[PDB]
Paper text:
Tailoring steps catalyzed by SAM methyltransferase-like proteins have yielded particular insight into evolution of anthracyclines and generation of structural diversity. DnrK is a canonical S-adenosyl-L-methionine (SAM)-dependent methyltransferase that catalyzes 4-O-methylation in daunorubicin biosynthesis. Recent studies have uncovered that DnrK is bifunctional and catalyzes additional 10-decarboxylation as a moonlighting activity. Here we have taken advantage of the natural diversity of anthracycline methyltransferases and employed extensive chimeragenesis to probe factors that govern catalysis and substrate recognition.
Here we wished to focus on the second clade of 10-hydroxylating enzymes, since R1 of CalMB differs greatly from both DnrK and RdmB. Region R1 in CalMB is extended by an insertion of three residues and has a Phe to His substitution at the critical site in comparison to RdmB. Despite these differences, DnrK CDDD behaved similar to its R1 provider with the highest yield of hydroxylation product (46%) shown with 5. The structure demonstrates that two aromatic residues, H300 and Y346, are positioned adjacent to the channel. The analysis is complicated by the fact that DnrK CDDD crystallized in an open conformation where R2 hosting Y346 has moved away from R1 and, as a consequence, H300 does not fully close the solvent channel. However, it seems likely that movement of R2 to close the active site will lead to rearrangement of the H300:Y346 interaction. Despite the different evolutionary paths of CalMB and RdmB, the chemistry appears to be mechanistically similar with exclusion of bulk solvent being a critical feature.
Residue numbers in the entry:
A (entry chain A), B (entry chain A): 13 to 287, 296 to 339, 343 to 356
């Protein structure tokens, strides 16, 4: 009743996440951590009005991201210190309006259009569809790859383990980001070679990362388009968090091109999510609707797509954050 | 540590308030309350895709606004029933993107600009400054007046009581919305007459409301502009939640025009807020920054403005939601 009003007001509140986002984009906590105690030093480091920044700090204190320690000095709280840039969970970057994802969340402001039409709303705001906007803006293209690659060192270890590489000769990582998954498979299967197929811009950072990993001998990088014939056959084609970017009819074209590049005996491996993990799942799934018109799919939806592409789901293996991921294995129907 | 990640993600989350806002704008709960049990009936009442609306409902269930009662039937929770349209707290309308305020919260998406410049960001989005956009869009103009007038029946009773009307002949309600405050003063002081000075559009709804109140005999309505000479003198000039819409230099011009329309012995009465009331206060104050470039002011800020307009603060009286309001009394310096 009395709390029913307060819970709705807090859940319906738009200023609160933009205050956090401004704080991240201003790099407020790093500037506090670099020794800006007063509001005056802090406005001067961030190029902001002193009195407008106090009003933001005041809200930041009241949502728990900041404390007034000495009168006028402001310290990050324990929640607030997750906004430091070197912090392992990368949450400052994921809330930076200057970067690709927190920029893309602005599409949620036209959420009604996406519910009415089913189509993404990103284009209405920024001019081109998600990945064309990145193709034209190298800062956003780069920002996107490092945001998604923020756990490349550990996030592919468990999926790579989950699979038997003994009879695999080559591996095709289709849209494999910076190559972290090809890298994990290389450091577990010492006899396997790999190719990463990615877009312009990303090919150069994946190559640079695989070089500095010591793996340019074993993992190549081909620039290309996975809607066209893949540049070589393989015994394993990896799609890690790719098909969720796409509506069903495009997802099928991707899976068909892979089925064609599949060698005799081959398997297609899909790495994606399953079903506060409901709030984690609901955020990613509403993000795919409003950015790209993709979706997270259930098991019965996968057999649909798979059947439509000439494939069958062999098995589903179940694998750092509170969330279980899946590894779908697909062979010719 | 583990909760530090979850608290930041929830506080930085932009989809969650837009999901609530979409639900309000779609009038989802009223349609459920009018007996749409299934998602199919519900998509057809709201003109939405069935599968996109299930994804929104799914997030609405997980933030507590909805429950799955029978498989596929969805009921509002106790929080969620605050989104019913006839509910006294009017929270459906305050979250409706079609209405003036939830439409204006979109300015919070450019929050960094307001911190850097101190200037409102509403104009950058919608073409004209806040009140010019309303002057051109009668639906928004009307929406704004009824949103602010949602407690006209009770919200002015305590301020009206707090003041002695015995020697007051006339009262000028400067920017008095739909006239609810002139109305409260009339129903307590039976010998006082009043004028409401308001903008185009609002004058007609205030007149209609004061008519249906039985008070068109005692309370007049003049259309006008409070930056120009007021249309008549008075012994009491009321500014209820007006000066917070304005930067200091404009606030002074408003107070100067009032000082001039003040009769011998007169008093200027300012009705505004004071200092989870910190979250209530911080929302209204960041709203005034991003919509109009106004601000909530402390006591020492009031003496500033007051001194600048030729006035002095006589006293401050302290007065339904968890929040204390103030009534400042101002006389010639
Ligand atoms: C924070 C959890 C997760 O990292 C899960 C998930 O990230 C997982 C797997 C991810 N992996 C695919 C490399 C990596 O290990 C990361 C640290 O954890 C995830 C996330 C976000 C995105 C995506 C995510 O996959 C996207 O794929 C994505 C995309 O393909 C295109 C545009 C945007 C995105 C994403 O924003 C994250 C998420 O669910 O946030 C709610
Ligand atoms: C919900 C609390 C309150 O009603 C207080 C406050 O509302 C109070 C006083 C208000 N009164 C001035 C008539 C009325 O009784 C209402 C029910 O409660 C308030 C509110 C909102 C606004 C405003 C508010 O004054 C505005 O004045 C305002 C404006 O002048 C111009 C544009 C927008 C607004 C507002 O959005 C509300 C608020 O603080 O929300 C956070
Ligand atoms: N038509 C296309 N051809 C090839 N790659 C594409 C593509 N459209 C999108 N992509 C790539 O698909 C990737 C999916 S998002 C990154 C996911 C990555 N596998 C990871 O798990 O970290 C993006 O990096 C994008 O550059
Ligand atoms: N230049 C101007 N002249 C007169 N009224 C104005 C004005 N600029 C804004 N206003 C009015 O000032 C009001 C302030 S908001 C409504 C507050 C009202 N007193 C209440 O307490 O309910 C608005 O209704 C708006 O129409």
């Amino acid at each position: 009743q009395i709390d029913a009003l307060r819970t709705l007001i807090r859940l319906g509140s738009l200023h609160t996440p933009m205050v956090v986002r401004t704080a991240a984009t201003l790099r407020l906590v790093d500037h506090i951590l670099a020794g800006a105690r007063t509001v005056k030093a802090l406005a001067a480091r961030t190029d902001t009005r002193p009195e407008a920044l106090l009003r933001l700090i005041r809200h930041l204190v009241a949502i728990g991201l900041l404390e007034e320690d000495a009168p006028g000095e402001f310290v990050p709280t324990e929640v607030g210190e997750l906004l430091a840039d070197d912090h392992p969970a990368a949450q400052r970057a994921w809330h930076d309006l200057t970067q690709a994802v927190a920029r893309a969340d602005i599409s949620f402001t036209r959420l009604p259009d996406a519910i009415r039409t089913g189509r993404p709303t990103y284009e209405s705001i920024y001019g081109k569809p998600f990945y064309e906007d990145l193709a034209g803006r190298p800062d956003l293209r780069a920002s996107f790859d490092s945001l998604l690659a923020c756990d490349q060192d550990v996030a592919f270890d468990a999926p790579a383990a989950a699979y038997d590489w003994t009879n695999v000769r080559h591996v095709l990582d289709v849209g494999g980001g910076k190559g972290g998954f090809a890298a994990a498979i290389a450091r577990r299967a010492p006899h396997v070679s790999a190719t990463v197929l990615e877009m312009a811009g990303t090919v150069d950072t994946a190559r640079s990362y695989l070089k500095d990993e010591g793996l340019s001998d074993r993992v190549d990088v081909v620039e290309g388009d996975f809607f066209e014939p893949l540049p070589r056959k393989a015994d394993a084609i990896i799609l890690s968090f790719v098909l969720l970017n796409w509506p069903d009819h495009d997802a099928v074209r991707i899976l068909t091109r892979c089925a064609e590049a599949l060698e005799p005996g081959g398997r297609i491996l899909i790495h994606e999510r399953a079903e506060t993990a409901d709030l984690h799942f609901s955020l990613l799934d509403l993000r795919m609707l409003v950015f790209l018109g993709g979706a997270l799919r259930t098991r019965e939806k996968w057999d649909g797509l798979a059947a439509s592409a000439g494939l069958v789901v062999e098995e589903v293996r179940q694998l750092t954050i509170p969330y279980d991921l899946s590894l779908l294995v697909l062979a010719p129907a």
